[PDB]
Symmetry: C2
Subunit: 50 residues, 2 copies
Amino acid sequence: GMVGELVYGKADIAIAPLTITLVREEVIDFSKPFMSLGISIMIKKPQKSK
Amino acid sequence: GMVGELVYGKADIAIAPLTITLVREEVIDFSKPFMSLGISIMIKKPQKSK
């Protein structure tokens, strides 16, 4: 994937929704967060007539 | 303040609710965020009556 192209030299930078994990930080250097997020819930409105 | 005691060698690390700003990143190495936050709103408890 994207991280791999950075480690093996097939690219010089990667910009995308890349999750800041420790397993990746060991091999590459991340920038500070430009978009903070977390797990959240998704449902209908609904609203329906009830 | 705390950032000063790192640049001047009076301390070895600063662990605190320290804002990750650009002016501070120029003089000290920040770690990744241990606690994401942002500006919010605070109001009273509504519907107290009656």
